[PDB]
Design a protein around this ligand. Structure first.
Ligand SMILES: Nc1ncnc2c1ncn2[C@@H]1O[C@H](COP(=O)(O)OP(=O)(O)O)[C@@H](O)[C@H]1O
Ligand code: VO4
Ligand SMILES: [Mg+2]
Length: 338
């Protein structure tokens, strides 16, 4: 498939604990139902996706959907496509606190590594098994945040907030002066995003709370070079893993505490991405897009191409108090494919 969509509900969080929240999410197979806390006497509204991940309990539960599961379904498939020579893209979408970061990066602790860590590990693991002595590989990485059309290099503490995206007359869009580092091992790449991840939540990020109102993009350019007598062949694929800004922040009217240039940019970004993805889906059903409408869809143009593969995971809170924005996330994920 050219587009894949999954939704994932998490355990109650602290806010939901204090409010004595009831669970309004249910799942069976690839289907998720959502109840209206006001009309609990109703028939839940249903939605179907490629995957409906029930992660509301804990790994102690036999039917808890774990980080390894989510990854073997979505991540593994994408990395395989990447070895074929094609670009891929994984997006985590949802309201602030729903589970986007946990799904993408997760926790360094045993058992909770997100999709990025597992994908990087799987990548070097497959690479190190290459017995063919006529095989050469290169892995370059970039880690950045997109805030109000401005890019912050997460891999370099001495040039942030200011980077701007450009468009090469022939090569495509690119961030000027963005660090792109060649890594030769997993322990190495594991340091870069550990380093990039802390940059995401240092005390200073709470000024504009860029942790939840910016898009975090982890890019990996994977080059494969084959040797045969004589020409050497080269396959280069781009992999973009993204932790989108919060969906409830898509408001550009002042609610609630979110600034105009902030939500405007976020609404525009999530809306455009929605058009691009559904557009890619209508396309793959039968068997040019407004990427310029947002810095995010513009920078990732080549990953949302024609032979590109994309997957999205929409994170969902299970709480009654988040019905509105959770319904809103189901619809958004629903439109992306349907
Ligand atoms: N599947 C899950 N398993 C365990 N904890 C999760 C899960 N999904 C979300 N959470 C918890 O909810 C919190 C908020 O989501 P996390 O991804 O930070 O941020 P956001 O959803 O805003 O990107 C974290 O403290 C995390 O531990
Ligand atoms: O992060 V604010 O200045 O919106 O409080
Ligand atoms: Mg987050």
């Amino acid at each position: 498939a050219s587009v894949k969509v999954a939704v994932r509900v998490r355990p109650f969080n602290s806010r939901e604990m204090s409010r004595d929240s009831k669970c309004i999410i249910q799942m069976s197979g690839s289907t998720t139902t959502i109840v209206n806390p006001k009309q609990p006497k109703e028939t839940p509204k249903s939605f179907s996706f490629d995957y409906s991940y029930w992660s509301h309990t804990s790994p102690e539960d036999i039917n808890y959907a774990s980080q390894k599961q989510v990854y073997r379904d979505i991540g593994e498939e994408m990395l395989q496509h990447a070895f074929e020579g094609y670009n891929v893209c994984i997006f985590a979408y949802g309201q602030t606190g729903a589970g986007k970061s946990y799904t993408m990066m997760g926790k360094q602790e045993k058992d909770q590594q997100g999709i990025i860590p597992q994908l990087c590990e799987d990548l070097f693991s497959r690479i190190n098994d290459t017995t063919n002595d006529n095989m050469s590989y290169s892995v370059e990485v970039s880690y950045m945040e997109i805030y109000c059309e401005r890019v912050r290099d997460l891999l370099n503490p001495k040039n942030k907030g200011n980077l701007r995206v450009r468009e090469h007359p022939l090569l495509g869009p690119y961030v000027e002066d963005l660090s792109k580092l060649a890594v030769t091992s997993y322990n190495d790449i594991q340091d870069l995003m550990d380093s990039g991840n802390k940059p995401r939540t240092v005390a200073a990020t709470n000024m504009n709370e860029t942790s939840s109102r910016s898009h975090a993009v982890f890019n990996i350019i994977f080059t494969q070079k084959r040797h045969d007598t004589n020409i050497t062949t080269e396959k280069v694929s781009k992999i973009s893993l993204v932790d989108l800004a919060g969906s409830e922040r898509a408001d550009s009217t002042g609610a609630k505490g979110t600034r105009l240039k902030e939500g405007a940019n976020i609404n525009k970004s999530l809306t455009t991405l929605g058009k691009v993805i559904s557009a890619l889906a209508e396309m793959d059903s039968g068997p040019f897009i407004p990427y310029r409408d947002s810095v995010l869809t513009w920078l990732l143009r080549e990953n949302l191409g024609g032979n590109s593969r994309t997957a999205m995971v929409a994170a969902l809170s299970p709480a009654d108090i988040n019905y509105d924005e959770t319904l809103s996330t189901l619809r958004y994920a629903d439109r992306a494919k349907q």
